[PDB]
Design a protein around this ligand. Structure first.
Ligand code: CLA
Ligand code: CLA
Ligand code: CLA
Ligand code: CLA
Ligand code: CLA
Ligand code: CLA
Ligand code: CLA
Ligand SMILES: CCCCCCCCCCCCCCCC(=O)OC[C@H](COP(=O)(O)OC[C@@H](O)CO)OC(=O)CCCCCCCCCCCCCCC
Ligand SMILES: CC1=C(/C=C/C(C)=C/C=C/C(C)=C/C=C/C=C(C)/C=C/C=C(C)/C=C/C2=C(C)CCCC2(C)C)C(C)(C)CCC1
Ligand SMILES: CC1=C(/C=C/C(C)=C/C=C/C(C)=C/C=C/C=C(C)/C=C/C=C(C)/C=C/C2=C(C)CCCC2(C)C)C(C)(C)CCC1
Ligand SMILES: CC(C)=CCC/C(C)=C\CC/C(C)=C\CC/C(C)=C/CC1=C(C)C(=O)c2ccccc2C1=O
Ligand code: SF4
Ligand code: SF4
Lengths: 31, 133, 80, 129, 58, 772, 29
């Protein structure tokens, strides 16, 4: 009844923000 | 001409002066004398033609203002130097100083109205046209 | 680059030209005032937008106007 | 301005022969040596001062921590490498990109090697017992 | 002149100073070091027999 | 070459100029047209260099203004002795310095404000009571030998005569006999006279007061004679001097021992004790007398160093020109011309020293208390430390201001060619960028430790904290220095020094919690005057906070000095002046680029610096030093008293500063929230003025943010609609209302920010320590 | 005894001799 997916916390709060920041870096610095 | 006597500083040229543009100011001096660098610190101008590389046009025009106000040196010339090596004279443009009126210049930026007769911003909506036209 | 406009109220006092630290401005001959001259802004790609010219202008409301526009390396005043 | 810090001879020789400046290297091998150096020492603060420092899996936690730090650093360096465009050979886009690849391989490898030394340093005196 | 008088002579004089102030009292069992050598006579008559020429007291 | 050149009656003494304010400057002499003129009059009134270009006329105004300021100080001192003489309980405090609170301000009974007169100051001669004073004046007057209030009244009259002398000489040396410019430039003669005459003979004459007044008065009070019965001239009678000091004033005669160089007789009244007397908690008066005798000798000696008129002595200009090297170019050449032609260069140095000395005074007075029974007056100890910390911080900022004014006004490239000054300017980017780095290093690695600790404690991880109960950061260099000074009296490097400050003796302890009564200095009221001061992890952390705040304040003020004349942004900044608002919205925007605006920003960081220092002092002294001792258990009960750190839960006992100051929540809860209970409950009693000042200072501080956060273009447009309504009803004034200038709006904001913030802590401190 | 603080002090003194040796050896070459 403690229902969490810790890997979903790691992915959505660590991994994809760093990858969105990398993606946003490519958007704002290209050309 | 030669560089003024200066031991170097940290307030001078950066990589912009290698890749984009730097500036050259040329003046003649009759007496060897000490002036303040716009970079910071004191230098001595030679008794001859002086050439000095500076980072901005404003630093060159500040030295020209110092050379006029303090040393009565009038004939300063400012060049824009491109990284390929091209020099383009930028000051003074037509040989006559800017404050004195000269027949031969074109009027640039003239708006044939007083400032309160500019149109409203709603008049120029959805265009790149500005109200100072 | 900033836009530096000169309006028809200019009395040709040349004070904006002397005030400008970038030599943006100059006097051309005119007929609209007793001095026979008017400020002009041929070199606004060097204009930094400091508005020292507007400070020097004596006419009620001013005959020279700086409109801050697109920023360049020159207009941001960068030595780097 | 010309200073004694800016002008020492065996200080100039040392900097010129660090792998980022050393003549004759490929940018991969540059990054490999740089990563191996940094990943080696970086496990030290992670293993000794990290939250699991007083448990038996403190070194493993410090190892995975260091790999995490190097991976995020590589993201910045590889992203920098894709966007530079500026100069020839070492500051080529492919040049910086090979350095980023070498940095990560060396960095993780330096941390694993430093892990193995910290985990198995009792073996260097195991002959006597 | 300098190597004979100072490098040999004064250095040997200084070593005789170490022996008299430090090493001989340590052999006597008296600890003399930097913390007390300014206030420890190496000889009880100290430096009064030296200047008056009565050197046999040492 | 040292002569006296004086022009006779250069300025007529007339009141004609009083009919025209603003006569002294050419813009102001045209009269007011706008309200800007009114503020311009006050801001320019003492800027004597804007009034004329004559350097001699500027030097004459400064010299005469200095006499007027000295007269102001002597009037202030005359008032202090007057209120001590006639409006005080000094007579009753002299009989009971540990049982009665000093009061020298009593309050008239209108509107109910006589609630501010309190009992525990009420005694005979002072029936109504008054405000408890925290200036320490009674401890100072008793120390230098005042016993009666009739002696304070004579001192009040003497200070008014010195004030009237000083004020007359300001009229004399401006309007009658004004010295020439070459008289002021005799810095070698001035240094000779100030070292030997002012400082040297001032200390020697004070030694004579200490020997013949302060020592025998204390000898009579220690004998048990009541201070109404104390003969003050007892040190002038050689016979009565004989009974207190048998060796120095003996059959082996006093002045006979002096001229025969039999000075060993004088060890009765001139000692080298060092430590504190256990009965008073203060320094020995014989040590204080020998101190002032020894520094009088050294200062009189120091006043013969410089050459004036008799060949011998040093030439400062030739000394400065000789101290140069390869790494520093022409070295100190030209600095003699700087320091003898720039009043701002001298003021920058002398403010830097006076501010730094005032801070040294704050540290040395708590640790080496000179005045009997003042170490147990905690509100006095808090006030004197805090006051001199604030004075010192303000003066150091003024040193940064006038160094910048020197760079704008008095700097000359011809004087400074490849000298020390020219070479500092040529690497100002190297200096400021390294200072930028070290402030970022210090701020991360000091404040980030507090934030780490806040977070670790909130997460339930107290073993992961930086603390004495957890990962320690011991200040091992300071503990080493304490060990050296603990061992030094009687030891090898000071064999005949009998003691030192008790703060050093921390050898021998690992916390202030485990402190016994034999280690502390408690007086007869059982209150601790001073103790060993333990330095642990919390003191490591707060000292690097101090280093952060000082380095940022240095960074701001030095950036203001080094970039006062030019930058890569504004290459001709010196032509805009010391004090200009900006150079317009261009170059991205140049608001606050002037050297004045760095002084403005530096004041907040000085405020931040001194606020941490006095908060550290207040909490650390209450938790680790001050308190009571019990004559059972030998137990030291500090003012706050020993938090238990859970951690396991096997509880760990630490002092409250060591257990709680290591994170910001501890500072908020255990310092600011807990100790504010005195000031917020002060209403209905005698500390209620502190509760009013606490609220009022919060208001003034908040009021300052209206000025700091806004801009004058808003306010000028708002004034336009209001001037319309006054225009509409024939009530518009001729002096046109303007919004404050951009610079003044900053100056008003920082003045009210400083006033509100400092007076809040003042009300907080004084209500805390006068209530408990 | 030679405590751990004194070993650390000795390496700091040795480091200063090391940079002094570095100054001399480059001035000699
Ligand atoms: C260069 C070597 C050298 C040096 C630097 C010293 C230095 C000193 N000697 Mg030593 N001494 C030396 C060689 C030296 N000595 C030799 C060769 C002899 C045998 C003659 C002595 C025999 C000697 C005696 C008997 C005494 C000294 C004392 C002293 C101290 C002088 C204190 C004073 O008030 O005068 C000073 C530390 C005096 C002292 O009081 O030491 C604390 C003292 O009484 N010395
Ligand atoms: C320079 C600092 C200073 C300060 C802050 C004060 C402040 C005070 N004085 Mg003091 N006084 C001073 C110097 C000072 N004095 C000097 C130099 C003298 C001459 C030696 C006096 C002689 C004096 C007397 C005789 C009395 C005071 C009184 C007072 C109190 C009421 C103010 C008043 O009556 O004004 C009136 C209001 C105005 C002048 C408004 C303008 C106030 C606390 C009175 C007091 O303490 O009452 C019990 C009082 O009777 N003062
Ligand atoms: C031994 C003689 C003597 C003594 C006791 C003093 C004492 C003083 N002088 Mg100095 N002065 C002296 C000789 C002396 N002067 C000489 C010979 C010169 C000329 C070289 C000066 C030139 C001088 C100036 C320009 C100033 C002082 C000032 C002062 C005052 C410093 C402020 C203070 O601490 O109170 C102090 C009263 C300052 C002052 O406050 O003047 C009122 C000040 O501005 N003095
Ligand atoms: C400028 C400061 C100053 C002044 C004005 C005085 C004044 C005096 N001293 Mg003092 N004294 C002083 C500093 C001063 N002293 C210092 C610095 C010392 C320490 C060396 C002394 C140590 C001292 C002794 C030992 C004696 C005096 C005595 C005296 C008195 C001289 C009596 C006489 O024979 O005719 C006279 C009141 C004599 C005296 O009669 O005392 C009552 C005396 O015996 N003085
Ligand atoms: C020996 C000390 C000393 C001296 C002689 C000077 C002298 C000078 N200063 Mg310097 N300065 C000093 C210390 C000193 N300062 C300190 C400690 C600071 C840091 C605060 C400064 C920072 C400073 C700046 C930033 C500037 C000066 C300027 C000046 C010059 C003009 C002063 C003037 O006319 O303002 C007129 C004075 C006033 C209008 C009164 C000031 C009132 C203050 C701001 C608020 C007082 C409130 C008070 C504390 C509490 C009252 C509350 C109560 C009423 C309810 C004059 C050369 C100015 C200059 O341009 O130099 C060329 C200038 O811009 N000073
Ligand atoms: C609490 C509010 C606050 C904070 C956090 C700061 C922080 C800072 N100020 Mg600012 N300042 C403030 C109020 C504040 N100031 C106010 C009110 C004014 C108006 C007068 C100024 C005006 C001012 C000036 C004029 C200057 C500064 C400078 C600085 C920097 C100092 C160097 C340093 O400590 O680096 C360490 C960084 C910190 C302590 C900030 C927070 C980081 C902590 C450790 C947590 C880390 C979290 C982590 C990174 C998250 C991931 C630092 C970034 C100076 C500067 O830029 O020098 C480099 C400088 O010259 N400030
Ligand atoms: C007492 C020991 C000693 C000393 C004082 C010297 C001193 C010197 N050596 Mg020598 N050397 C030594 C032992 C020593 N050596 C030994 C044991 C060998 C192997 C046989 C050498 C082989 C050697 C070679 C091959 C060279 C020197 C050189 C030098 C000179 C410059 C040093 C330098 O630039 O280092 C560089 C700085 C460091 C190593 C920093 C650490 C200097 C005079 C050099 C020279 O040019 O002489 C003219 C040079 O080329 N030495
Ligand atoms: C600390 C270093 C030290 O004390 O050096 C002191 C060194 C002294 O050099 P000189 O032998 O030139 O000193 C002559 C002195 O009279 C200063 O002019 O000064 C410098 O090299 C300039 C300061 C740079 C220091 C930057 C840090
Ligand atoms: C050489 C080397 C190195 C270096 C490296 C580098 C070069 C790095 C880089 C770095 C980088 C390169 C980084 C980056 C970062 C980025 C970021 C951090 C970003 C962010 C972003 C953001 C924040 C966003 C925002 C936004 C936008 C933009 C829009 C939309 C909205 C939003 C808001 C979302 C190292 C250390 C390895 C070591 C070895 C060698
Ligand atoms: C004292 C001194 C010094 C030094 C310093 C330092 C700072 C150092 C450091 C050092 C370091 C810091 C080191 C490190 C090392 C490292 C290593 C030794 C590594 C190794 C690694 C490895 C072996 C890896 C491998 C691998 C793997 C595992 C996997 C993947 C792949 C690879 C291959 C990468 C100098 C010289 C300057 C000078 C003189 C004095
Ligand atoms: C004896 C005595 C006291 C007589 C009374 C004296 C008489 C007659 C009038 C009194 C006027 C006075 C004393 C003050 C008004 C000052 C004023 C225009 C404030 C508005 C203003 C605010 C609120 C800002 O935040 C600000 C921020 C940045 C730049 C400018 C401004 C600014 O301008
Ligand atoms: S804004 Fe400044 S740079 Fe531009 S024209 Fe006006 S004075 Fe010249
Ligand atoms: S906002 Fe104010 S200070 Fe900043 S550039 Fe504009 S006028 Fe100047």
């Amino acid at each position: 009844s403690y229902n969490v997916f810790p890997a979903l916390v790691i992915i959505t709060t660590l991994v994809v923000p760093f990858m969105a920041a990398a993606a946003l870096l490519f958007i704002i610095e290209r050309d | 001409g030669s560089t003024p006597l200066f031991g170097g500083s940290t307030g001078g040229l950066l990589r912009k002066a290698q890749i984009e543009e730097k500036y050259l100011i040329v003046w003649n001096s009759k007496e060897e004398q000490v002036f303040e660098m716009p970079t910071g610190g004191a230098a001595t101008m030679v008794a001859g033609t002086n050439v000095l590389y500076l980072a901005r046009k404003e630093q060159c025009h500040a030295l020209h203002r110092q050379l006029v106000s303090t040393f009565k040196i009038r004939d300063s010339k400012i060049y824009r130097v491109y990284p390929n090596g091209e020099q383009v004279l930028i000051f003074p443009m037509d040989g006559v100083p800017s404050e004195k009126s000269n027949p031969g210049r074109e009027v640039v930026g003239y708006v044939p109205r007083k400032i309160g007769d500019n149109p409203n911003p709603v008049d120029v909506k959805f265009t790149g046209k500005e109200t100072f036209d | 680059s900033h836009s530096v406009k000169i309006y028809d109220t200019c009395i040709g006092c040349t004070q904006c030209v002397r005030a400008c630290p970038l030599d943006v401005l100059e006097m051309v001959p005119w007929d609209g005032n007793k001095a026979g001259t008017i400020a002009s802004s041929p070199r606004t790609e060097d204009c930094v937008g400091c508005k020292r010219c507007e400070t020097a202008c004596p006419t009620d409301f001013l005959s020279i106007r700086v409109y801050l526009g697109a920023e360049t390396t020159r207009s941001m005043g960068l030595a780097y | 301005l010309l200073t004694p810090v800016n002008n020492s001879t065996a200080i100039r020789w040392f900097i010129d022969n660090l792998p980022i400046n050393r003549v004759g290297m490929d940018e991969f091998t540059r990054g490999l040596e740089i990563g191996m150096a940094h990943g080696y020492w970086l496990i030290g603060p992670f293993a000794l001062l990290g939250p699991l420092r007083n448990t038996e899996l403190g070194l493993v936690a410090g190892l995975v921590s260091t790999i995490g730090l190097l991976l995020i650093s590589t993201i910045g360096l590889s992203g920098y490498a894709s966007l530079v465009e500026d100069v020839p050979t070492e500051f080529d886009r492919k040049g910086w990109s090979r350095l980023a690849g070498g940095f990560l391989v060396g960095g993780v490898g330096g941390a694993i090697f430093a892990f193995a030394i910290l985990q198995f340093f009792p073996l260097v005196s195991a002959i006597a017992r | 002149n300098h190597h004979l008088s100072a490098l040999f002579g004064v250095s040997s004089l200084a070593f005789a100073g170490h022996m008299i102030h430090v090493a001989i009292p340590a052999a006597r069992g008296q600890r003399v070091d930097w913390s007390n050598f300014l206030n420890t006579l190496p000889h009880p008559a100290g430096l009064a027999p030296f200047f008056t020429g009565n050197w046999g007291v040492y | 070459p040292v002569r006296v050149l004086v022009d006779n009656d250069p300025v007529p003494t007339s009141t004609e100029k009083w009919g025209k304010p603003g006569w002294f400057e050419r813009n102001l002499a045209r009269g007011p047209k706008t309200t800007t003129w009114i503020w311009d009059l006050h801001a320019l009134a003492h800027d004597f260099e804007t009034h004329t270009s004559d350097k001699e006329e500027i030097s004459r105004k400064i010299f005469s203004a200095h006499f007027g300021h000295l007269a102001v100080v002597c009037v202030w001192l005359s008032g202090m002795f007057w209120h001590g003489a006639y409006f005080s309980n000094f007579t009753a405090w002299m009989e009971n310095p540990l049982g009665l609170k000093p009061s020298a301000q009593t309050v008239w009974p209108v509107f109910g404000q006589e609630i501010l007169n309190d009992p525990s100051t009420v005694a005979k001669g002072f029936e109504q009571g008054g405000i408890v004073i925290t200036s320490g004046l009674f401890h100072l007057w008793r120390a230098v030998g005042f016993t009666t209030t009739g002696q304070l009244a004579a001192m009040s009259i003497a200070m008014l005569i010195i004030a009237a002398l000083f004020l007359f000489a300001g009229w004399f040396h401006y309007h009658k006999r004004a010295p020439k410019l070459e008289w002021f430039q005799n810095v070698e003669s001035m240094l000779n006279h100030h070292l030997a005459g002012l400082f040297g003979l001032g200390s020697l004459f004070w030694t004579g007061h200490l020997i013949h007044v302060a020592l025998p008065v204390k000898a009579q009070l220690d004998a048990g004679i009541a201070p109404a019965q104390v003969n003050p001239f007892a040190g002038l009678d050689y016979g009565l001097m004989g009974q207190y000091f048998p060796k120095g004033f003996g059959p082996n005669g006093g002045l006979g021992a002096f001229f025969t160089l039999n000075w060993g007789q004088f060890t009765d009244f001139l000692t080298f004790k060092g430590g504190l007397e256990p009965a008073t908690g203060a320094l020995y008066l014989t040590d204080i007398a020998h101190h002032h005798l020894a520094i009088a000798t050294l200062f009189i000696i120091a006043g013969h160093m410089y050459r004036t008129n008799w060949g011998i002595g040093h030439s400062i200009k030739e000394m400065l020109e000789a101290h140069k090297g390869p790494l520093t170019g022409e070295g100190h050449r030209g600095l003699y011309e700087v320091l003898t032609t720039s009043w701002h260069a001298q003021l920058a140095i002398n403010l830097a020293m006076a501010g730094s000395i005032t801070i040294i005074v704050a540290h040395h007075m708590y640790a080496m208390n000179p005045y009997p029974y003042m170490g147990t007056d905690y509100a006095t100890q808090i006030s004197l430390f805090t006051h001199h910390m604030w004075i010192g911080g303000f003066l150091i900022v003024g040193a940064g201001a006038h160094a910048a004014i020197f760079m704008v006004r008095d700097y000359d490239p011809v004087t400074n060619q490849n000298n020390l000054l020219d070479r500092v300017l040529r690497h100002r980017d190297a200096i400021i960028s390294h200072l930028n780095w070290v402030t970022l290093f210090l701020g991360f690695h000091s404040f980030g430790l507090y934030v780490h600790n806040d977070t670790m404690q909130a997460l339930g991880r107290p073993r992961d904290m930086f603390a004495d109960f957890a990962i320690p950061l011991q200040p091992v260099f300071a503990q080493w220095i304490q060990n050296i000074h603990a061992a030094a009296p009687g030891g090898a490097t000071a064999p005949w020094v009998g003691g030192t400050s008790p703060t050093w003796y921390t050898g021998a302890l690992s916390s202030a919690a485990t402190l016994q009564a034999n280690q502390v200095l408690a007086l007869a009221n059982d209150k601790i005057s001073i103790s060993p001061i333990h330095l642990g992890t919390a003191d490591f952390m707060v000292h690097h906070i101090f280093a952060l705040c000082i380095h940022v304040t240095v960074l701001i003020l030095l950036k203001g000095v080094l970039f006062a004349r030019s930058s890569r942004l504004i290459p001709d900044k010196a032509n805009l002046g010391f004090r200009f608002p900006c150079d317009g919205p261009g170059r991205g925007g140049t608001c606050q680029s002037s050297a004045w605006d760095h002084v403005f920003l530096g004041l907040f960081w000085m405020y931040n610096t001194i606020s941490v220092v006095i908060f550290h002092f207040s909490w650390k002294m209450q938790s680790d030093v001050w308190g009571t001792v019990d004559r059972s258990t030998g137990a030291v009960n500090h003012i706050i008293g020993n938090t238990d750190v859970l951690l396991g839960g096997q509880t760990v006992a630490l002092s409250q500063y060591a257990a709680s100051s290591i994170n910001i929540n501890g500072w908020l809860r255990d310092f600011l929230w807990a100790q504010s209970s005195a000031v917020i409950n002060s209403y209905g009693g005698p500390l209620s003025a502190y509760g009013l000042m606490f609220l009022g200072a919060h208001f003034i501080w908040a009021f300052s943010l209206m000025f700091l956060f806004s801009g004058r273009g808003y306010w000028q447009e708002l004034i336009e609609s209001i001037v319309w309504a006054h225009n509409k009803l024939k009530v518009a004034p001729a002096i046109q209302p303007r919004a404050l200038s951009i610079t003044q709006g900053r100056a008003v904001g920082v003045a009210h920010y400083l006033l509100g913030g400092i007076a809040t802590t003042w009300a907080f401190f004084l209500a805390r320590f006068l209530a408990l | 005894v030679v405590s751990g603080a004194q070993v650390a002090i000795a390496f700091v003194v040795a480091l200063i001799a090391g940079i002094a040796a570095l100054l001399l050896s480059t001035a000699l070459g």
